[PDB]
Amino acid sequence: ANLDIAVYWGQNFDERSLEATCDTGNYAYVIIGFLNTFGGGQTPALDISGHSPSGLEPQIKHCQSKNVKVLLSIGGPKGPYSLDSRSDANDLAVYLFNNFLLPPGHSENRPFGNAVLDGIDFHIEHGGPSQYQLLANILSSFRLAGTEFALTAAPQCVYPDPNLGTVINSATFDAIWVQFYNNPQCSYSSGNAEALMNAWREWSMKARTKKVFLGFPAHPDAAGSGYMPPEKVKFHVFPAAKKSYKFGGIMLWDSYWDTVSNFSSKILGEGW
After folding, report:
1. What is the spatial distance between Cα 104 and Cα 118, in angstroms, rounded to a whole number?
2. Which of 125, 194, 202, 231 is catalytic?
3. Which residue from 20, 110, 180, 246 has the highest number of Cβ atoms inside 10 Å of its Cβ?
4. Cα separation of 25 and 249, whole Å?
5. Could you tell me the sign of the dihedral formed by the alpha carbons of 142, 144, 150, 154, in that order?
6. Domains in the chain and their CATH numbers?
7. Dist CA 255 CA 51 (whole Å)
C-alpha cells in the first residue's frame, strides 16, 4: 500500500497531545479543529476543546520538523459559523492569511504564536455554499502570490455535497477527504459495503481534485454510523480504491478515538 493517513486533532481536552500524535509516525497530515465561530457579526474564535492555543506553537513546529503537515480546519460539526456576505469572506480570508499562513508581522496577534500552518481545511457542515467560493478564490490568490499552502475540504458522502459542491467543482482543493460516516445512504452498513462502494465510485470519478481520501471513524463510538473494522477496509476497499489515480489515502475521525482503538496501527502493519 504505502499509505498516507490524515487525522483530525483537537476534539478532547484529555487527548494525546499534538506532539505525541505526530511522533506516532502514523500520519502524513494532522488537521487541527476547529475555527468554529465567524461571520455574521462575530469575531473569529477557536474551539479546540480547551487546549491552550499559544501552547500549541512548539508542538506544531515539532510536527513540521518530522515532515507532518499541520492544517487548521474552519467550520466543524457544530458552531455559530456562517459566511453570508462578500465582506465576511474577505474578512475571514485576510484574517487566516495574516494570522496562520504568513510569518510574523510583529505587532497585532496570533493564536498559535509564531507557528506558520501548512494549509486550511474547509469542514463546512451547514450554511449552503453561501460565499465559500469567494473565500476560496481569495485564499487561492494568496497561494499564487508566494505563500505556499494547501486548501482541503471535508464534504459529507452524498454527491454533490450541498455545502461545498459548487466550491469543489472549481477545482480549487488540493485534496478532499469525504466523510463516509453518519449517513447510511453512503457509508458502511450491515456488512453491506455496496452503498459505500457506489459513493466512492462517484466521488473518485467526479470530484475535481487531485487526491480523494476515504474518511472513516476510528472507533464505533466515534460516529453515529459507518464504523468499518480495519480488516474489512483493507480487504474490501483498498483493492478497488487502489485502481484509482485519484486515491489519496484515508482520513480518520479522530485522534482521540484512534489512540484508543489503534485503528491506524492496524491499517498499516504496526506504524512505528
Report:
1. 15
2. 125
3. 180
4. 15
5. positive
6. 1-272 (3.20.20.80)
7. 14
